[PDB]
Amino acid sequence: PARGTLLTSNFLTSYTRDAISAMLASPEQAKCNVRVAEFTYATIGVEGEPATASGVLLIPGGERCSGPYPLLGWGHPTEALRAQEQAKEIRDAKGDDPLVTRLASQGYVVVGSDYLGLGKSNYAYHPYLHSASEASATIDAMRAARSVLQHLKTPLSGKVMLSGYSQGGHTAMATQREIEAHLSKEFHLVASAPISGPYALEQTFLDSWSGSNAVGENTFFILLGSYAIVAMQHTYKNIYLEPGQVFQDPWAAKVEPLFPGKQSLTDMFLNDTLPSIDKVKSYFQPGFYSDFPSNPANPFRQDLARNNLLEWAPQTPTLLCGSSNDATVPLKNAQTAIASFQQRGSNQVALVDTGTGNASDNSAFAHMLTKESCIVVVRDQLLDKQR
Numbered sequence: 001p002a003r004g005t006l007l008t009s010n011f012l013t014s015y016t017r018d019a020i021s022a023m024l025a026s027p028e029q030a031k032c033n034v035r036v037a038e039f040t041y042a043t044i045g046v047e048g049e050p051a052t053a054s055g056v057l058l059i060p061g062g063e064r065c066s067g068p069y070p071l072l073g074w075g076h077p078t079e080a081l082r083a084q085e086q087a088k089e090i091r092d093a094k095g096d097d098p099l100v101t102r103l104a105s106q107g108y109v110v111v112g113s114d115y116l117g118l119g120k121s122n123y124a125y126h127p128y129l130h131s132a133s134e135a136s137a138t139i140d141a142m143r144a145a146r147s148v149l150q151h152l153k154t155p156l157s158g159k160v161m162l163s164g165y166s167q168g169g170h171t172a173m174a175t176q177r178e179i180e181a182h183l184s185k186e187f188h189l190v191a192s193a194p195i196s197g198p199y200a201l202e203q204t205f206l207d208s209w210s211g212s213n214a215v216g217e218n219t220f221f222i223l224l225g226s227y228a229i230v231a232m233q234h235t236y237k238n239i240y241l242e243p244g245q246v247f248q249d250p251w252a253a254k255v256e257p258l259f260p261g262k263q264s265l266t267d268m269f270l271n272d273t274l275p276s277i278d279k280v281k282s283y284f285q286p287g288f289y290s291d292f293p294s295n296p297a298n299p300f301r302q303d304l305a306r307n308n309l310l311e312w313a314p315q316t317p318t319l320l321c322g323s324s325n326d327a328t329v330p331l332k333n334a335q336t337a338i339a340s341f342q343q344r345g346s347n348q349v350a351l352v353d354t355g356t357g358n359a360s361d362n363s364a365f366a367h368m369l370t371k372e373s374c375i376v377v378v379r380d381q382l383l384d385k386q387r
Helices: 017-024 086-092 098-106 131-152 167-183 201-208 221-236 265-270 277-282 286-294 299-305 332-343 366-386
Strands: 006-015 033-044 050-061 069-075 109-113 156-165 188-195 318-322 349-353
Touching: 006 086, 006 131, 017 033, 017 098, 033 086, 033 098, 033 131, 050 086, 050 098, 050 131, 069 131, 069 167, 069 366, 098 109, 098 366, 109 131, 131 156, 131 167, 156 167, 156 366, 167 188, 167 318, 188 366, 201 221, 201 286, 201 299, 201 332, 221 265, 221 277, 221 299, 277 286, 286 299, 318 332, 318 366, 332 349, 349 366
Parallel strands: 069 109, 069 156, 156 188, 188 318, 318 349
Antiparallel strands: 006 033, 033 050, 050 109
């Protein structure tokens, strides 16, 4: 099966323009009804072998919303529940999701892949924070969606845009880099707006390795760090033979099945499935824990480095969004990225900060606030202007 081939597609539900406006009034108003669709497609694994993945497709429509519509590829945030599908989540939430209320309702066709190893994908694990497969998964999700859209005769303008939140920001940028480098004829990319993504991946882990960074405590670090470790091992198979080489017991024997597994990140954190950040020294093996921040040859550190998104020159008008209150993914990531891009001859990337400006609000939880806040900001400041 050629990459991007549409295997199955199904329409779940639809939300009226008024119902969406009602949610927004709880005053921005929707201009489009929104149809929720799901689909599965052919794509590739981290070794280029065949694999499948699932995705979500939001289609705008309405008397005050005639086409043509731009196509926006979206990268979702860290997902530890293997079976999780975005389309069904939106359906369960009855349209209560910013992708519907802020973008699709305004005329943006939204396409998002559940990523390899998640949703309906047949991949044995999820290549968490793996630039190449995050990009290939997104690219192919967009290819399959275009087939669904063509069959429906949905009017597309031809313009393509990208965005994503958290891990999704990393996904969005990784996808942008891949398109510009090889697929500019297939995808006419006119705007990219990564949100709170760890572009300076390796340095981000180094900075929060103690459990806290310049911004504040990185509360979810044990969970996000463990996911990265297990994933990078799966992807590169160069960190350890037994989890016991990296984690202390009893965590060594229970960590791999969780990323991804039968538990959502919320579940794990609320029920202390893994120790809290203040007990990090009893979690990671002392050797590994001290070696990572002081040894650039550390295999996990090397795998993170291979997934940095700094060494290139963005050509698409880009707007990195995030918050100075964010202690989960420090805005330093965007700043470092900008400096790197400018040093490589690119002036296409801008930055916007949605933080309160009050250090009193710095927090790991300020991270989730950037999702809708930034969706709105990047849409108003960049996306709308590139339609």
